[PDB]
Amino acid sequence: MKKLFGVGPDLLGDGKVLFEWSPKGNFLAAAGSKRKVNIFDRNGRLYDEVHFPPAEYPNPDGRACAAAQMQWDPAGEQLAILPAGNTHVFIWLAGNKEVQKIESEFKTQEFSCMAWSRNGMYLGVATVKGNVMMYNARERKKTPLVGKHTKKIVAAAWNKDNIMALAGQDKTVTLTDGVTGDTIKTFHLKDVPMDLCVSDKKEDGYSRREENTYSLNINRKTLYIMQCTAEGDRPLELAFLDTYGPIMKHSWFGDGYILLGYKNGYVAVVSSHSREISEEVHSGKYLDTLTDVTYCASLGRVAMAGANCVRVLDANADYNEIKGDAVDLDANQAIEKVGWTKDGQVLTVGTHNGYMHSFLASLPMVYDFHGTRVLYLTSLLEMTLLDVSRRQTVARIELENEPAFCGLGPSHAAVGMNNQAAFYSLGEKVGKVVQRREYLGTITAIKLNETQAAVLTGGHVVVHPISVEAGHAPDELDVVIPGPGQPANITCVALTPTFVITGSRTGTLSYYLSPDVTPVNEFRHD
């Protein structure tokens, strides 16, 4: 991979880096030893800095993390930071930057773990005495629930059934409803778990599509799979080989698969169904240390957390160490948490002494084709007009605006965060700022030709020659193809020099011989 961004022990301190990505992909919150969380950007810039109050139970270990267990809800609206040794839960809003300090309603009781709902409207944060507070995102009220466990709940996860599930130190799994507040089911473990991953167990029979099968890594060696969907009520026993090491943390992923991250660098995958349950489909030695395993369920990428390096396993290619994706770091750190973006853009690597490490994955598909020339992208700052046939660089188009679209015209290239048209000429200057047209609507289907860009924005084919001279404005030069007074129905436009081909919803494939507004032909796609 190529290095995108990385922070030393300055905004984190000389400690372990624990992170979680937003599902939006534009926010990454990394917490280090010092009591500050660095919310990052898609480029890795510091989006927001939050300062914690002095903790009532400060951490005596320097090589650790200030946040006990933080996570992002799968909606991208709130960040629930849970600092270590505190009596508060910081809901960080990604919209207005304000920190919602939710005090503990259990009369100054130290929190242990939290869990985000898959729907996003529910939140359950656990204490070290087993008490779990209830918080709803849609109403902003705090509801205390006194008594769920008798000891510290190490981790917790929600499900799609709105059932609060907990992994407490009292060797119990409480499946309490998030609406009625009643314990629906209770599963008794044999020892102390440390994680809780709730995902579907697909079988060849009939199983429920909602998250109802739970899984807990017990003693960091043994994983129980109890089904609640349609079959059985017992934790179906899994026996794993002791030579592979201890599973430091499991994480359910894929089609019922289990990401068995064995602490000795071993990786296994166990399928979960009725016929064979205890078999290990994936078997291979990959590292010597595995302090963290993780999965992104969009690219099939499994990241390792070794003592010195980070190995990327491509689940699309049967968990192979792609060294073009794998990362070797300096021999003075120890990757404690490794992660992916929830949709997957950046390999996120956190070491034990504050080296924030983040690496751009396989490059995004920001490409447009106009003949053999391809307006593809090589990095988030510059896309590259590079011909496939010649493999010799034609244009390294710098993108001051965010790369979200590229309109490959023979004259210009329109880039921007789907409303800005950062028109980038491809002639005398590569990537020059021709126009910065923050359009009135989203730039849906722009089409650039030798003069104009058919900026189909707001359902209107905005047609305007991009090379606007000094003293002129493209805004008045926007020749709206379904002009003001004509209904807008075009959902794709093929701006060509011969014809401005506009694909309407009504089928009016209009053919404007003059590039502005006048047709000599109009195809009716009935």
Taking the C-alpha atoms of residue 460 and residue 445, their distance in angstroms, rounded to an integer, is 10
User: How many Å from the N-terminal Cα to the C-terminal Cα in the chain?
Assistant: 49
Report yes or no: 209 and 200 within 8 Å, Cβ to Cβ. Answer: yes
Report yes or no: 229 and 209 within 8 Å, Cβ to Cβ. Answer: no
Taking the C-alpha atoms of residue 450 and residue 227, their distance in angstroms, rounded to an integer, is 61
**222-256 per-residue burial string, b: 16 or more CB within 10 A, e: under 16:** bbbbbbbbeeeeebbebebeeebbbbbbbbbbbeb
In the chain, the largest separation of any two C-alpha atoms, in whole Å, equals 80
Structure tokens at 34: 């010092």
Distances in Å between the Cα of 337 and the Cα atoms of 13, 41, 86, 495 are 15, 19, 22, 49
Distances in Å between the Cα of 286 and the Cα atoms of 210, 291, 305 are 33, 13, 11
Helix (H, G, I), strand (E, B) or coil at 244: helix
Taking the C-alpha atoms of residue 414 and residue 452, their distance in angstroms, rounded to an integer, is 11
Cite the beta strand spans of 300-451 per DSSP E: 301-303, 309-310, 312-314, 320-321, 327-328, 335-340, 346-351, 356-360, 369-370, 373-377, 382-386, 393-398, 407-408, 413-415, 420-425, 432-438, 443-445
Taking the C-alpha atoms of residue 464 and residue 391, their distance in angstroms, rounded to an integer, is 32
Helix (H, G, I), strand (E, B) or coil at 79: strand
Structure tokens at 10: 């300055």
Q: Tell me which residue has tokens 């089928």.
A: 507
Report yes or no: 379 and 2 within 8 Å, Cβ to Cβ. Answer: yes
Q: What are the residues whose beta carbons fall under 8 Å from the beta carbon of 471, sequence distance 6 or more? A: none
Report yes or no: 229 and 208 within 8 Å, Cβ to Cβ. Answer: yes
For residue 205, the 8-state DSSP code is S
Report yes or no: 482 and 492 within 8 Å, Cβ to Cβ. Answer: no
- Elucidation method: cryo-EM
Taking the C-alpha atoms of residue 159 and residue 321, their distance in angstroms, rounded to an integer, is 31
Taking the C-alpha atoms of residue 200 and residue 227, their distance in angstroms, rounded to an integer, is 9
Taking the C-alpha atoms of residue 6 and residue 48, their distance in angstroms, rounded to an integer, is 16
